[PDB]
Amino acid sequence: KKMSIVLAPFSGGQPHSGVELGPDYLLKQGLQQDMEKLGWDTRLERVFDGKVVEARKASDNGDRIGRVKRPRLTAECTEKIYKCVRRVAEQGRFPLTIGGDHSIALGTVAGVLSVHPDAGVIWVDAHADINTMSGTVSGNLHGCPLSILLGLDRENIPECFSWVPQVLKPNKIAYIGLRAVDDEEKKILHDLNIAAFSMHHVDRYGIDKVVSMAIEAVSPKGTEPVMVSYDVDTIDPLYVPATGTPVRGGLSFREALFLCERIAECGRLVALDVVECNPLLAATESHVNDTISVGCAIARCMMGETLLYT
Amino acid sequence: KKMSIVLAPFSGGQPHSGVELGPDYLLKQGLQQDMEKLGWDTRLERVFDGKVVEARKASDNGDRIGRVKRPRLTAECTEKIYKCVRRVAEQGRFPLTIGGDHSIALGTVAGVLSVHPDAGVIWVDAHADINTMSGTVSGNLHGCPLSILLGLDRENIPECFSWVPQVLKPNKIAYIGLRAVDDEEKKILHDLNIAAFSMHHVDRYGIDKVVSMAIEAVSPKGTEPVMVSYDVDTIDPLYVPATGTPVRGGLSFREALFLCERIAECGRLVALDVVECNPLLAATESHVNDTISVGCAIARCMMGETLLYT
Amino acid sequence: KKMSIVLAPFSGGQPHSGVELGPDYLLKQGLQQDMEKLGWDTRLERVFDGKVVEARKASDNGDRIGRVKRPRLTAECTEKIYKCVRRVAEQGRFPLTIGGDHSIALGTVAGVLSVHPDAGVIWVDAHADINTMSGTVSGNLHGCPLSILLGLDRENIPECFSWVPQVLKPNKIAYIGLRAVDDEEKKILHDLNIAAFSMHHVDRYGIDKVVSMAIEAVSPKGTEPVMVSYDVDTIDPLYVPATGTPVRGGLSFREALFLCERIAECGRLVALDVVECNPLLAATESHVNDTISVGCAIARCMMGETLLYT
Ligand SMILES: N=C(NO)NCC[C@H](N)C(=O)O
Ligand SMILES: N=C(NO)NCC[C@H](N)C(=O)O
Ligand SMILES: N=C(NO)NCC[C@H](N)C(=O)O
Ligand SMILES: [Mn+2]
Ligand SMILES: [Mn+2]
Ligand SMILES: [Mn+2]
Ligand SMILES: [Mn+2]
Ligand SMILES: [Mn+2]
Ligand SMILES: [Mn+2]
């Protein structure tokens, strides 16, 4: 029962700065102590200096390839994350990555599928993060990771991303909590027949059924390893206010956590990313505390924490 | 695919002024652009000058018939709405009416049932709005429309309402989200055996089942046209604060919208009223924005807007 | 149809003062008028002077037996409550007790099971309140009542509690809404196989199923009398802010009340405690009003109040 808590304080995949503070905030909230308390032999893994990267992002506004903003910087860092996560798994340890915007998952998923190529992927998010380099309207790379992992729009993808291994198929990715999908993404998900459960399915079937369906969609043989990339903005902003791109009509705090327990209960989770926590994007001390403690809550629940006897 | 957005800035059916501003606010929120974006060939239909009517209401406190307040004024305006909506339907266009307090539905429903006499009616509301002229304690006519449409207490109903055609039967009206019913109304609904789904059924069966049940109750042959008069105060005030008579324990924002999609999904909606939006009844700019954007949201969702590919 | 509204303004079972104001606040909110309106022939029953007891608690910091704080004082008062409730039932009247912290339930449950020894007990709470005298970390007796009623840790229980009759078995107590259980309590509930439904079951099955399950667990023959000790802190603090130990992820206002109706609908409720309302533990006038009116709401709903015709 060994765990490596991968710190990924990156913010180049999007406009607002502050999300790179996630790792620190989470850790000071007692994340590592919590994993220990859950019986996890933990050790931190730093991939790069958070402030050094902020400097390179704040200045170099010349790092672009079309509407895509900061592709080189995002490629460099996500590659270091990929390599890091890859080793962590080769060592037979569970990698829990703390972001940082969601573009880090390009490194995480790439790293996990490198050791567990048959792993399914549950993308808990309000967004589909599948925009292509050519299609991305905003150009914020945190909304493009999946397109890159899937190898879509191969032609218009640059050199700085050639390091990205092609190991993720459409039938191994399942969304949950979607409600802010771009027209381009709606078509893509439909073209590729990606299993996506929007808030509509949650309202229709309740979180339980959805989770069940989500897990089945990426787990054919019922034995496959499961990975969850958890974007906190999936949860209604009235619970998670400190986040870059909030959208109303999100999961309730109870659903956000129940979802984790169902997964833990699955007994096949091999990795977890907890992203989009931006402390500087709050109004009070409770805005940040509620947000960060929610992050730690997803971690404890995913890692086995239950409300009753265990 | 033709639509007429009927503007009904009336506030005589109740105490608070400001609800007649609904139409304008909605429209500036981009309501018509939204219907266009949904592929609806739209055109506005003005029934009367909003400020002119406010003047006649503010002054003439002598317009009463018992406890009933402003019956003449309400009759005059709701008649113009009736006629308007009637023509809009005769033209084969979908009428989307924006209020204005709920007393306008006397004109809307009367207008719709004039062209589609077999249309069922789903009343999404926290209130039953079925009080009689004689029974109404408050005297606020926005809580009496259904009694008039149903022809109840025929004897004590005045001359100014003789224009109201009798075309609505008890078996063609179904409530959803009820939680603030008057004793008089509880008896009536029971006497007439009106299908009413209070918050109790939502909590008990969940919004999906309720919607299904609500649609079946007014649609025997499974082919009948469906009309929905949507009172925004059905939604919990923590979502829709700017409304005249809010009651706690309402539908969540997610339920409010999911309900619409289920209906749209029904493929038989022939008309829709979106009422009780009172901008001046807020505390902040978000109170109004949240309320008005919620109004536009019900419109988009009812008219086909989905979270995923369509 | 006779009812005795037992006033129990006690606060010795916990740190914060103000919760003894519950009874008064509730009553001024019209609690008794409400029970009358529901057709209940009511009469108040005062057990002791609320301010006199506050004086004895504020001063005597020497009243302890280990980590347990104020055992003598709690024993004296809960005994008076026991006796009171016992008589109220012997008189064939329904006892509705208003607290006051949850340690009063030692008197209430003891009183009810004295006249209805086969009565099941539904503990609506975020906490299990089953800590032992020896195990209690906090020492706040409001989290120990059930251990005393169950006769657990008999050896380390003091003289001042010998008056407590042993009439409650593990198979006659069922929790609902649990989410803040201590490690000690988790073991106990598991050892004794106590039917406990945490927020996890609510999220998983919805409030309806849970209530059904909760009622079945304590009602084998399907004829047994039912008692509910209702801790308002079971409801999410965003609904019930004025309470001593709030925990996020609670029941929604709708669930809090729906739960009551299901019970009322059961037709076998023989007693009800409504506890933990601390007016002085608010920030605004709405904090207190919302809290206290919620208390009265649970009362009306439990006692038969429905949203539709009855
Ligand atoms: N934060 C996210 N996703 O996680 N926002 C993505 C927003 C938008 N879809 C884009 O392409 O930029
Ligand atoms: N706003 C509404 N209904 O839509 N309130 C109705 C209130 C009350 N039932 C009455 O007769 O006036
Ligand atoms: N308010 C309550 N329960 O109702 N809190 C109990 C807290 C804690 N379990 C204890 O032993 O003190
Ligand atoms: Mn994301
Ligand atoms: Mn997102
Ligand atoms: Mn209405
Ligand atoms: Mn209403
Ligand atoms: Mn308690
Ligand atoms: Mn409690």
Side-chain angles (χ1 to χ4, degrees):
Chain A
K1 207 171 185 180
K2 309 162 291 180
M3 172 188 285
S4 286
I5 298 185
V6 183
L7 311 194
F10 185 57
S11 68
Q14 50 75 65
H16 305 75
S17 297
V19 63
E20 77 278 356
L21 298 181
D24 303 324
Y25 277 81
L26 275 283
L27 285 180
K28 67 175 179 178
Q29 279 289 288
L31 179 61
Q32 176 168 33
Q33 289 65 53
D34 285 326
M35 299 302 110
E36 299 294 4
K37 182 176 179 70
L38 278 292
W40 281 94
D41 181 8
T42 75
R43 83 182 182 194
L44 313 184
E45 285 289 325
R46 291 192 174 63
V47 190
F48 56 64
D49 189 310
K51 8 284 183 296
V52 173
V53 175
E54 266 295 293
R56 179 148 55 174
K57 172 193 172 186
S59 50
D60 194 52
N61 284 27
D63 180 356
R64 298 188 50 163
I65 299 182
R67 278 177 295 192
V68 179
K69 291 192 286 288
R70 292 173 281 278
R72 296 163 188 55
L73 180 53
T74 304
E76 188 191 317
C77 300
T78 51
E79 176 173 41
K80 299 187 178 185
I81 295 175
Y82 155 49
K83 296 178 174 170
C84 182
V85 175
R86 206 177 85 84
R87 190 161 46 67
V88 177
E90 298 178 309
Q91 307 179 327
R93 305 175 69 74
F94 177 112
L96 171 41
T97 310
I98 304 295
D101 66 65
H102 221 164
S103 67
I104 74 175
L106 182 63
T108 67
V109 177
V112 177
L113 285 282
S114 292
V115 174
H116 295 294
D118 60 309
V121 178
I122 304 290
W123 197 272
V124 185
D125 203 320
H127 317 78
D129 295 342
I130 191 168
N131 272 302
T132 55
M133 306 282 89
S134 314
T136 176
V137 195
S138 66
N140 296 319
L141 242 38
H142 65 163
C144 301
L146 280 169
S147 61
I148 302 180
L149 286 165
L150 286 170
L152 308 175
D153 188 36
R154 214 79 180 74
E155 183 188 66
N156 300 65
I157 300 183
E159 173 62 23
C160 58
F161 280 114
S162 282
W163 70 258
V164 189
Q166 299 304 295
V167 295
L168 192 281
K169 300 296 87 169
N171 57 188
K172 301 292 291 180
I173 185 287
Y175 297 106
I176 299 185
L178 299 180
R179 61 182 181 290
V181 191
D182 303 324
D183 296 323
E184 300 78 6
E185 296 184 296
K186 296 185 176 180
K187 183 194 177 184
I188 298 179
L189 307 191
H190 174 265
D191 291 333
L192 300 180
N193 186 209
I194 299 302
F197 306 89
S198 65
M199 290 310 293
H200 182 75
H201 306 76
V202 183
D203 298 345
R204 210 171 201 286
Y205 311 121
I207 191 65
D208 195 76
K209 181 54 180 168
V210 170
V211 180
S212 294
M213 298 199 277
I215 295 175
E216 321 165 17
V218 301
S219 300
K221 289 54 196 170
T223 166
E224 295 88 0
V226 171
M227 155 166 218
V228 184
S229 192
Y230 209 129
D231 191 331
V232 302
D233 74 17
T234 302
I235 309 163
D236 192 276
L238 83 87
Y239 291 121
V240 179
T243 185
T245 47
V247 191
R248 57 182 185 183
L251 291 171
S252 56
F253 164 106
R254 286 164 48 173
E255 297 174 308
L257 263 39
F258 173 91
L259 176 168
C260 301
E261 306 176 305
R262 263 309 297 296
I263 292 291
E265 180 178 294
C266 149
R268 289 181 287 121
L269 179 65
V270 293
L272 169 77
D273 307 327
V274 175
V275 310
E276 292 303 335
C277 285
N278 182 318
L280 304 176
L281 214 299
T284 68
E285 301 288 302
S286 64
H287 273 51
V288 186
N289 181 300
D290 293 319
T291 303
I292 306 295
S293 73
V294 165
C296 300
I298 302 167
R300 295 198 298 286
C301 293
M302 276 292 180
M303 305 323 291
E305 185 195 75
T306 57
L307 294 185
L308 287 182
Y309 190 66
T310 278
Chain B
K1 207 171 185 180
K2 309 162 291 180
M3 172 188 285
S4 286
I5 298 185
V6 183
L7 311 194
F10 185 57
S11 68
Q14 50 75 65
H16 305 75
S17 297
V19 63
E20 77 278 356
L21 298 181
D24 303 324
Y25 277 81
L26 275 283
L27 285 180
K28 67 175 179 178
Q29 279 289 288
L31 179 61
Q32 176 168 33
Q33 289 65 53
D34 285 326
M35 299 302 110
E36 299 294 4
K37 182 176 179 70
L38 278 292
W40 281 94
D41 181 8
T42 75
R43 83 182 182 194
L44 313 184
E45 285 289 325
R46 291 192 174 63
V47 190
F48 56 64
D49 189 310
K51 8 284 183 296
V52 173
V53 175
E54 266 295 293
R56 179 148 55 174
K57 172 193 172 186
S59 50
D60 194 52
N61 284 27
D63 180 356
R64 298 188 50 163
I65 299 182
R67 278 177 295 192
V68 179
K69 291 192 286 288
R70 292 173 281 278
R72 296 163 188 55
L73 180 53
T74 304
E76 188 191 317
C77 300
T78 51
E79 176 173 41
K80 299 187 178 185
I81 295 175
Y82 155 49
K83 296 178 174 170
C84 182
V85 175
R86 206 177 85 84
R87 190 161 46 67
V88 177
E90 298 178 309
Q91 307 179 327
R93 305 175 69 74
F94 177 112
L96 171 41
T97 310
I98 304 295
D101 66 65
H102 221 164
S103 67
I104 74 175
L106 182 63
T108 67
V109 177
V112 177
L113 285 282
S114 292
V115 174
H116 295 294
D118 60 309
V121 178
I122 304 290
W123 197 272
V124 185
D125 203 320
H127 317 78
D129 295 342
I130 191 168
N131 272 302
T132 55
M133 306 282 89
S134 314
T136 176
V137 195
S138 66
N140 296 319
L141 242 38
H142 65 163
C144 301
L146 280 169
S147 61
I148 302 180
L149 286 165
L150 286 170
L152 308 175
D153 188 36
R154 214 79 180 74
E155 183 188 66
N156 300 65
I157 300 183
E159 173 62 23
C160 58
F161 280 114
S162 282
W163 70 258
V164 189
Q166 299 304 295
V167 295
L168 192 281
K169 300 296 87 169
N171 57 188
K172 301 292 291 180
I173 185 287
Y175 297 106
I176 299 185
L178 299 180
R179 61 182 181 290
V181 191
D182 303 324
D183 296 323
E184 300 78 6
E185 296 184 296
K186 296 185 176 180
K187 183 194 177 184
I188 298 179
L189 307 191
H190 174 265
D191 291 333
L192 300 180
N193 186 209
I194 299 302
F197 306 89
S198 65
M199 290 310 293
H200 182 75
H201 306 76
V202 183
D203 298 345
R204 210 171 201 286
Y205 311 121
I207 191 65
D208 195 76
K209 181 54 180 168
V210 170
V211 180
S212 294
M213 298 199 277
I215 295 175
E216 321 165 17
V218 301
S219 300
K221 289 54 196 170
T223 166
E224 295 88 0
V226 171
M227 155 166 218
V228 184
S229 192
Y230 209 129
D231 191 331
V232 302
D233 74 17
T234 302
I235 309 163
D236 192 276
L238 83 87
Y239 291 121
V240 179
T243 185
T245 47
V247 191
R248 57 182 185 183
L251 291 171
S252 56
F253 164 105
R254 286 164 48 173
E255 297 174 308
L257 263 39
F258 173 91
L259 176 168
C260 301
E261 306 176 305
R262 263 309 297 296
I263 292 291
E265 180 178 294
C266 149
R268 289 181 287 121
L269 179 65
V270 293
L272 169 77
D273 307 327
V274 175
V275 310
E276 292 303 335
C277 285
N278 182 318
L280 304 176
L281 214 299
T284 68
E285 301 288 302
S286 64
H287 273 51
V288 186
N289 181 300
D290 293 319
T291 303
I292 306 295
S293 73
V294 165
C296 300
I298 302 167
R300 295 198 298 286
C301 293
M302 276 292 180
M303 305 323 291
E305 185 195 75
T306 57
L307 294 185
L308 287 182
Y309 190 66
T310 278
Chain C
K1 207 171 185 180
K2 309 162 291 180
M3 172 188 285
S4 286
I5 298 185
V6 183
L7 311 194
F10 185 57
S11 68
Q14 50 75 65
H16 305 75
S17 297
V19 63
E20 77 278 356
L21 298 181
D24 303 324
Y25 277 81
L26 275 283
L27 285 180
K28 67 175 179 178
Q29 279 289 288
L31 179 61
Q32 176 168 33
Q33 289 65 53
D34 285 326
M35 299 302 110
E36 299 294 4
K37 182 176 179 70
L38 278 292
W40 281 94
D41 181 8
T42 75
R43 83 182 182 194
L44 313 184
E45 285 289 325
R46 291 192 174 63
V47 190
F48 56 64
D49 189 310
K51 8 284 183 296
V52 173
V53 175
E54 266 295 293
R56 179 148 55 174
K57 172 193 172 186
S59 50
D60 194 52
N61 284 27
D63 180 356
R64 298 188 50 163
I65 299 182
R67 278 177 295 192
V68 179
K69 291 192 286 288
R70 292 173 281 278
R72 296 163 188 55
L73 180 53
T74 304
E76 188 191 317
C77 300
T78 51
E79 176 173 41
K80 299 187 178 185
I81 295 175
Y82 155 49
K83 296 178 174 170
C84 182
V85 175
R86 206 177 85 84
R87 190 161 46 67
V88 177
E90 298 178 309
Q91 307 179 327
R93 305 175 69 74
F94 177 112
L96 171 41
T97 310
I98 304 295
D101 66 65
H102 221 164
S103 67
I104 74 175
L106 182 63
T108 67
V109 177
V112 177
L113 285 282
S114 292
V115 174
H116 295 294
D118 60 309
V121 178
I122 304 290
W123 197 272
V124 185
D125 203 320
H127 317 78
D129 295 342
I130 191 168
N131 272 302
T132 55
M133 306 282 89
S134 314
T136 176
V137 195
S138 66
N140 296 319
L141 242 38
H142 65 163
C144 301
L146 280 169
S147 61
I148 302 180
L149 286 165
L150 286 170
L152 308 175
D153 188 36
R154 214 79 180 74
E155 183 188 66
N156 300 65
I157 300 183
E159 173 62 23
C160 58
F161 280 114
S162 282
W163 70 258
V164 189
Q166 299 304 295
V167 295
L168 192 281
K169 300 296 87 169
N171 57 188
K172 301 292 291 180
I173 185 287
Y175 297 106
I176 299 185
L178 299 180
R179 61 182 181 290
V181 191
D182 303 324
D183 296 323
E184 300 78 6
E185 296 184 296
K186 296 185 176 180
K187 183 194 177 184
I188 298 179
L189 307 191
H190 174 265
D191 291 333
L192 300 180
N193 186 209
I194 299 302
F197 306 89
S198 65
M199 290 310 293
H200 182 75
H201 306 76
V202 183
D203 298 345
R204 210 171 201 286
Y205 311 121
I207 191 65
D208 195 76
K209 181 54 180 168
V210 170
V211 180
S212 294
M213 298 199 277
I215 295 175
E216 321 165 17
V218 301
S219 300
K221 289 54 196 170
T223 166
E224 295 88 0
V226 171
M227 155 166 218
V228 184
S229 192
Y230 209 129
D231 191 331
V232 302
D233 74 17
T234 302
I235 309 163
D236 192 276
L238 83 87
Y239 291 121
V240 179
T243 185
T245 47
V247 191
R248 57 182 185 183
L251 291 171
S252 56
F253 164 105
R254 286 164 48 173
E255 297 174 308
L257 263 39
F258 173 91
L259 176 168
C260 301
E261 306 176 305
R262 263 309 297 296
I263 292 291
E265 180 178 294
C266 149
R268 289 181 287 121
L269 179 65
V270 293
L272 169 77
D273 307 327
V274 175
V275 310
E276 292 303 335
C277 285
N278 182 318
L280 304 176
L281 214 299
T284 68
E285 301 288 302
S286 64
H287 273 51
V288 186
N289 181 300
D290 293 319
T291 303
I292 306 295
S293 73
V294 165
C296 300
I298 302 167
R300 295 198 298 286
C301 293
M302 276 292 180
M303 305 323 291
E305 185 195 75
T306 57
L307 294 185
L308 287 182
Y309 190 66
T310 278

